[PDB]
Amino acid sequence: MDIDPYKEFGATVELLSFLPSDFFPSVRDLLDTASALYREALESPEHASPHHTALRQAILAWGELMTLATWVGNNLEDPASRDLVVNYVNTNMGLKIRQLLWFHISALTFGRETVLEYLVSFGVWIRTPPAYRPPNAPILSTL
Amino acid sequence: MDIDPYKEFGATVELLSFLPSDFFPSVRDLLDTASALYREALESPEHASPHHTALRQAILAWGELMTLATWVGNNLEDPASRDLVVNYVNTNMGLKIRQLLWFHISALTFGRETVLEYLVSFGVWIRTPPAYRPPNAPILST
Amino acid sequence: MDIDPYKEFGATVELLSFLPSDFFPSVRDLLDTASALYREALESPEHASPHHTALRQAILAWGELMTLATWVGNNLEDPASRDLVVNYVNTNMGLKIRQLLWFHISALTFGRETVLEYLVSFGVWIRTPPAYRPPNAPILST
Amino acid sequence: MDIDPYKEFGATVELLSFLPSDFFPSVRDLLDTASALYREALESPEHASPHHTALRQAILAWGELMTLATWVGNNLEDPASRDLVVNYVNTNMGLKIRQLLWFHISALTFGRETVLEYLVSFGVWIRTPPAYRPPNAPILSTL
Amino acid sequence: MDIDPYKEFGATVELLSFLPSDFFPSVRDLLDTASALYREALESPEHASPHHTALRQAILAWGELMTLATWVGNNLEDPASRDLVVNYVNTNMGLKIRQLLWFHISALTFGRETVLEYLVSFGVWIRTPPAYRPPNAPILST
Amino acid sequence: MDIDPYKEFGATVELLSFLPSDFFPSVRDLLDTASALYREALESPEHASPHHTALRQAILAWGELMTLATWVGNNLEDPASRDLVVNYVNTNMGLKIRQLLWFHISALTFGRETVLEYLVSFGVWIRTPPAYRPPNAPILST
């Protein structure tokens, strides 16, 4: 249905159908980051923060969809459909899973408040047109 | 990569490669009852329990992949391709999504511990041969 | 030689020559659910309960005799011999191993006392003739 | 599966896929020892130590496999298969059941700590080659 | 069997097979820095801090490998096997020992926590795109 | 540069290139004992005692060398260079890693001082002639 997912974390999709697309790093890189940083933290029987839980389910999903891409590569003969589907996956679903993942890693590493404020500052940066923005966009100061 | 998805819920995927596949319901009725029961708790700005949060993320992914199937059927030409893809969606990954949903929903409306006991009891039910089987497997109620 | 195997579990082999043979499940699903439920407690350096310990030793013997059957099928020539042996394994001694497993596993997930009550209730169920029998024998849940 | 059985008693299979084969006494002798020493101790409704319990289940198993050997003797016509199976039983399964049994009797009689330390000392003895080992290998001093 | 040489220093091989390999500089510079900066501490027979001790054993092992390469060059004249050997050495063991030396030296000089948070920050930097990364990458502070 | 990996544990390579090499047994038995006896401590991410840590790094290095031998056997077909390589490995690095593993394991199990005085006693034993040595050589006591 029409649920707002981040509503319990203060954000909203309109606050993140707002950023550009290139900002979020590549998906493989997100997964490697999350795993290498929080391997034993995520494998543990503890819901120490819900960020971990949503992150965990999202990673399950992305594993399932990489399985989808591989499987479709294994069986579908129509090459246009194969290429089109794989591109749609890695592009649009890619964008959404990147939103989700990057958000949760950021909340973990720097705190939900810091990311919330960073997004507001980025928004004020990007609503501004080229003629008056700074050359560089803001950055996550952890304190 | 090495994720144990259900580790923070006192359960394990070993314990759900342990039910069968066909037991789980359709996604449609399941999603509908989830909505009708927890509209507010899902829309709220509150992490009332982690169950709600994992559920939110699952609904996101499911809606996005419904949009995927629809977009794919909007553009491709090979109908065999479209049918095969939308089967892989509604059948194979659907099993995963249904596992995840059914677990979290039942845990919400009943509790974690009751679900664990139910899974163990279904284990005792299904490992049993047919002849001395009960007539009706358990249907959980609070 | 005169061992009463289940004497330290408030039960007796008389009370399990009292169920039938066919009630017990396959070794495969049973072992699988055991693993999926008690991976850690079996791997741990802890005798959390004697049930775990007897279970460990049973899994050892079962794995070793699977290796036995495989080795025997690796070398012999007479296929009648191989089939007869691997039947004696998966059928006759399998019954013993399944008794032992099912008892300890069910006692783990539920408790000793619940298992005792279940056995007595199955006794009352099966000694009863078919006509006034219940439709479904008991399926234990916590 | 890949369980480590002795992990709750401090040992490990690598610590006992380490000894030689001749060391463990004959199986019939193990059973006679265990029975004559702890007949009423094992028949009792007491799990006074888990050693007793694992010992009890192991003896059940060996009874079942002696029944296997006898039964195969009763029915199998192919003599090579009969001899081969009986030898495999009394040899490899023999070795493993001897490991288990001797361990548990030792833990009972002398305490798990003493056997643990004895195994370490035996290991230090046997890793040493012939040129520098003592002529005799160590022995279970109960104190 | 499950030997992870970073388990007790707050990390794992995955966290170090997370950066690109090219960041970890060539072994010669590492050894030179180690010697020039801790001649005394590595010559000292005191188990001051375990980082030093791992570093000791690591340097001994690398010296052993260089001795091996020497023995090969001075005894095996054949070029194909020799070259493949030296490539395997300077590539795979090169990678591992570079990782190890960099981590331990950095932890000694600066500190454990600082190295870990540096890895995390460098990760999220290099994964992050160029148009919105910080202008200059992070770097270790005394 | 003057790297002596025993400097902080009360010894030196000379004191271990003092016994005959044949006393230090083959690597397989060492690794098996280490695993079977300290699976947990070597899997634990805690710098409990530096002996453990040196042992960790040493096992990683030996595994790396075995991986090297594997890579050579799976890529270099020439037998002369390959055989000379494996001989150098299983001889020289074999010696050093045997020395190291024996010392550290023994020190863990029994204690530092006991290993040192054992070396001293074994030395003065084997150097001493047969007609007036003790009847049986010394041996480590718990």
Numbering used by the authors:
A (entry chain B), D (entry chain B): 1 to 143
B (entry chain A), C (entry chain A), E (entry chain C), F (entry chain C): 1 to 142
Please quote the authors directly.
The virion is composed of a structurally distinctive capsid (called core-antigen) containing the genome and polymerase, and surrounded by a lipid envelope with embedded surface-antigen protein. Capsids are composed of a 183-residue polypeptide, the first 140 residues of which suffice for capsid assembly. The assembly domain is also unusual in that it polymerizes according to two different geometries i.e. T = 3 and T = 4 icosahedral quasi-symmetry. Accordingly, the same polypeptide chain exists in seven quasi-equivalent environments (A, B, and C in T = 3 capsids, and A, B, C, and D in T = 4 capsids).
The T = 3 and T = 4 capsids were reconstructed to essentially the same final resolution– 3.5 and 3.6 Å, respectively, and atomic models built into the resulting density maps. The structure of the T = 3 capsid described here is the first at high resolution for the apo form. The T = 3 A chain has the highest potential energy throughout the minimization process and the T = 3 C chain has the lowest with an initial potential energy 24% lower than the T = 3 A chain. The T = 3 AB dimer has the highest potential energy throughout the minimization process. The T = 3 CC dimer initially has a potential energy 42% lower than the T = 3 AB dimer and remains the lowest with continued minimization until replaced as such by the T = 4 CD dimer. The analysis was then extended to the T = 3 capsid. Here again, the CB interface was smaller, having ca. 20% less area, 19% lower free energy, and 30% less burial of V124. The same analysis performed on the three interfaces in the T = 3 capsid again identified F23, F122, and with lower confidence Y132, in all three interfaces. As with the T = 4 CB interface, V124 and R127 were not identified as important in the T = 3 CB interface. Three of the four quasi-equivalent dimers are asymmetric with respect to conformation and potential energy, however the T = 3 CC dimer is symmetrical and has the lowest potential energy while its intra-dimer interface has the least free energy of formation.
